[PDB]
From Swiss-Prot, chains A, B, C:
It comes from the Viruses. Homotrimer. Interacts with the inner capsid protein VP2. Interacts with the outer capsid glycoprotein VP7. Interacts with the outer capsid protein VP5*. One of its GO terms (molecular function) is metal ion binding. One of its GO terms (cellular component) is viral envelope. The VP6 trimer contains a zinc ion located at the center of the molecule. The zinc ion is not essential for either trimerization or transcription activity of the DLP. Zinc-depleted VP6 has an increased sensitivity to proteases. GO terms for biological process: fusion of virus membrane with host plasma membrane. Keywords: Calcium, Capsid protein, Intermediate capsid protein, Metal-binding, Ubl conjugation, Virion, Zinc. This is Intermediate capsid protein VP6. It comes from Rotavirus A (strain RVA/Cow/France/RF/1975/G6P6[1]). Pfam families: Rota_Capsid_VP6 (PF00980). Gene3D superfamilies: 2.60.120.170, Viral capsid alpha domain. Intermediate capsid protein that self assembles to form an icosahedral capsid with a T=13 symmetry, which consists of 230 trimers of VP6, with channels at each of its five-fold vertices. This capsid constitutes the middle concentric layer of the viral mature particle. The innermost VP2 capsid and the intermediate VP6 capsid remain intact following cell entry to protect the dsRNA from degradation and to prevent unfavorable antiviral responses in the host cell during all the replication cycle of the virus. The N-terminus is blocked. Sumoylated with SUMO1 and SUMO2. Sumoylation of viral proteins seems to have a positive role on viral replication. Ca(2+) binds at residues 266, 286.
Amino acid sequence: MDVLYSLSKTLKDARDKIVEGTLYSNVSDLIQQFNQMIITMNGNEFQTGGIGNLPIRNWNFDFGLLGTTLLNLDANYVETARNTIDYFVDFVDNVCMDEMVRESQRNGIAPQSDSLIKLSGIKFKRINFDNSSEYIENWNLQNRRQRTGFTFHKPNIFPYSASFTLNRSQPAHDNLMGTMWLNAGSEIQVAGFDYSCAINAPANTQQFEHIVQLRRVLTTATITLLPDAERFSFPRVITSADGATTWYFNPVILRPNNVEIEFLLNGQIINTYQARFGTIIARNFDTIRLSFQLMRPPNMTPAVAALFPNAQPFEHHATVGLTLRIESAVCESVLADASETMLANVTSVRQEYAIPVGPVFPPGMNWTDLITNYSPSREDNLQRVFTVASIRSMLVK
Amino acid sequence: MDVLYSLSKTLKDARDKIVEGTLYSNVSDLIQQFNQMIITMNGNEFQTGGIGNLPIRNWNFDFGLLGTTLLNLDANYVETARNTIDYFVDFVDNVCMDEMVRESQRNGIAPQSDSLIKLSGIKFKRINFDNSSEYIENWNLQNRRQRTGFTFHKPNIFPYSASFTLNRSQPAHDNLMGTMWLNAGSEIQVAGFDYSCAINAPANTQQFEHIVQLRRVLTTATITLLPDAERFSFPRVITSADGATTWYFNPVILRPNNVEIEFLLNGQIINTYQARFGTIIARNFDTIRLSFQLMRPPNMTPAVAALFPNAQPFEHHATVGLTLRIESAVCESVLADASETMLANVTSVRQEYAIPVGPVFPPGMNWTDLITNYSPSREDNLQRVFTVASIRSMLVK
Amino acid sequence: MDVLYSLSKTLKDARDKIVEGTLYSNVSDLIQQFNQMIITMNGNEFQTGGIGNLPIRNWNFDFGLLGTTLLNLDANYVETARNTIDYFVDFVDNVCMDEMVRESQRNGIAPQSDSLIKLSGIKFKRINFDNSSEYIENWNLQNRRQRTGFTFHKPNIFPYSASFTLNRSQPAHDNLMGTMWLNAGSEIQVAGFDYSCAINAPANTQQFEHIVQLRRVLTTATITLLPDAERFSFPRVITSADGATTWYFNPVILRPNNVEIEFLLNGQIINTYQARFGTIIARNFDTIRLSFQLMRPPNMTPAVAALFPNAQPFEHHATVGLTLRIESAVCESVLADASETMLANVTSVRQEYAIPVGPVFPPGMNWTDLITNYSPSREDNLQRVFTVASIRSMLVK
Ligand SMILES: [Ca+2]
Ligand SMILES: [Ca+2]
Ligand SMILES: [Ca+2]
Ligand SMILES: [Ca+2]
Ligand SMILES: [Ca+2]
Ligand SMILES: [Ca+2]
Ligand SMILES: [Ca+2]
Ligand SMILES: [Ca+2]
Ligand SMILES: [Ca+2]
Ligand SMILES: [Ca+2]
Ligand SMILES: [Ca+2]
Ligand SMILES: [Ca+2]
Ligand SMILES: [Ca+2]
Ligand SMILES: [Cl-]
Ligand SMILES: [Zn+2]
């Protein structure tokens, strides 16, 4: 991985710095590194591809070194350098794709393609150079058994889940009480409804609760918490739990009462916020618990009184809700988020080359399936595959 | 462009590295580059501005070289260096603004200001240095006729469009069937409504479809697809198609049935997803097609039955919807997105200096107008102008 | 600050570049810088911690220099280098945390911990090196009394505010007119309602207005403006202004008429947009003013006519709204946003070590409280603290 990264890094720097007119002193060290790369590769043969429709490609290295005697580089110097650069870029791109389309239940963190396995040999170690990207830094820190951390914008931590739970129901579904929600990506919306508006409830208050267990701990999370669940604030016709019929939801929204959000880690409360809407920080957690209540308004104007009778039929359904969004966070495991193209790169290369479903990843690299059962093997393979996607993106986008 | 970029890059590195106390070995190469820049500029005169209220400014270069003999830089060394740096920064900033406020139907990708045209001369090529930003890398790759790729967070690909299409309507607008939507930025929300709840429809199912044609292909897109269109889930009074009257929309939402999203490229299905909500990958597409149905519930509790009579008046309007958001994607053409300040920089400089409307860009650099008719000339000019904005932002924010 | 940053930068580069196999020429300059750091620190003793539960830690420097004679670095070279690196990383991390948990009403921009105060001494200035991060660049520019600019994605500029204003009301709350809104983070949603649907209003039009005053000027803002306020498009039971009772809101949405958004700076209109939805640029402003109207539909189909009678009771409440979101912007003052982890880092370190509430920051570093009363002292302390968090994140995430 580090050598593959170094190949890419060497090529990116070469492409960027070996430009017409530049002082040789601006590239002297890079030329040394570039030539070290040529010397190390020269004489070797590699073959990539062959899985799915990823073409079999042969690579042969017999390049001359780059000159070291111009004061300022001229166009001919730059152009001959690019001939070599373009070939190596094509090679790196193919090694990356070959590596990205493979997986292993047994040793997922290890190189899977022939070329990466070959590049992991001790004779290729002299190419190693400036491992500075966040992904390679993390790869290296992991390897030395140290603490790794990936920063995400809208971390895709919640597998898609949209459902409800009726805590009080009856065949006619005319006097229900329960919750409905949508957990997806970095967002949670949950509504608690009570068709009776807590008419016979103790203290005329109905308690609700929504618990979400993350598959990985998130640290240093910046979160937006807002009252109301807009998604569950409109009239709906929903399928019954058994799928046998449909019920009617006609919500009228009240402010959630006694809101308490707890960010827990291994059952322990790490952060707790009582009725605080806006931006809050959750520093270390693997579980979110949202508790909120519907309290029947003790004083009601006529228009309100008319919505909540003492007896059925209950035609306006009292609803309270919350919306929680994780804007950014750090995770020790790789994850998909709203900004990085890694998942999309890996998924795209596999799709383009008709790569057959393997033993590790769910069909289509489906994110929900992946995060729902995020096993150690899937994570090691995902990290390997995400790191390669990031090496490839330094040169090919 | 590359020389202008190099000027900015040289100045940014100088400002960052030529700091008090630093080992001379930390800046030796930079000093060489800095001095190459001074030597190349010395003796030249440039003039910027004069368009709109952008002031006419004269620049004269007659600077001494930076010394090369301190072991660790002292405060006096740093301060005399900054006198030169600040002047060059002011110059670069003015060249950038002068370039950003100009456009050309004929040769939009080429330098438009006198200073950039002057800097494109062969005598200024020795300043060229470390072209490493994503924008200049792309500029250079484009120039060598190679594949460029810009990565965006929430790519602003959809011109604002908010409308409806009544597939079945009548003067009273009491039994409509059709769709309404909002395409804007990176998001699409579309709802299909049938006032009759498919009472007389074959298989009691009404089919809907929404097609969106992108003005540019997006690759490696990470997308969130969710059922329901919250934006079209509430009661509305809308203007009729002919503007002569207003109709009433009183939606009740049902789950979209047989959801199928197709990401097509030149008429070919590249990706297709059947009822998959959550995160999905669209690898290469220029068109999105959302197909969904409203199926009359075969089994209805009384409360539901009451909403859907066998005869008019139809007072509750059955509605199904979808929401699609492009979180990130790569595009071969520059675009505005939710994170980059390029469009805002260009638009801001033009607005501040009262730059008159030109022959290429729509008044006010209006994004919707621009993307709606994204001609080759507008793109070449936009890219030139975005690349300059990015050169300027290395020094002036 | 600059020396602390330089320590971190030196360590990050060392960790990244001093890798097995690398050409010595790839690290020669860094080794010089690394050794300059060792020489400068050697002989010194520092102590960190002791506030709250941040442990008291002692640091002693007596390290040998790194060798300068290998052609390509070997594993033993890399491993002995890491022993020194890991210790310095641990030291930098502790200095950062000690600094991040402190504050001062008097001189908030100045170092507060013993270690940072010690590192600000002239004898430690030789460590200074390549101050290139956006935060340190800004710190340095501020210091030279120059223009600083931080770029944010979804700048968290609006303190949480969710409320309403009844311009016409009566005890029964059966014929209200006013506005309700939610200002939070980078978003504003505001709705204007008129239970009478402007039946007795001049020109059958009711005017609305929403003004939001930013605590800091935002420049180069890319904004999404859309008609309708989904958050206020559903039925609600709300508490009365005096808290004595509850009123009923049963909205029916109409298109906002004569929409005018003004971005003002010190009372002056800098940007104005008339009914333009989609993406707009606001280049320099400290205030946003949204003006919109509800115009009674001059022509109504029966279904619409039935919602708006000539006399009470008014059962369907005409509502018009707007949604405005600041996607990105530049601010001269540090702020929390949807991507940076600074606020979360500072807040997290203080929470983890049970740091007592101080004299500057609100309890829990509460963002709303902070931005609501963003005094000069809070900003100077926030900037110091955010810059340290950013120095720490180069090594520890
Ligand atoms: Ca062969
Ligand atoms: Ca990231
Ligand atoms: Ca309703
Ligand atoms: Ca756990
Ligand atoms: Ca792991
Ligand atoms: Ca002149
Ligand atoms: Ca971007
Ligand atoms: Ca096409
Ligand atoms: Ca193009
Ligand atoms: Ca002591
Ligand atoms: Ca930022
Ligand atoms: Ca002001
Ligand atoms: Ca300030
Ligand atoms: Cl976002
Ligand atoms: Zn975002």
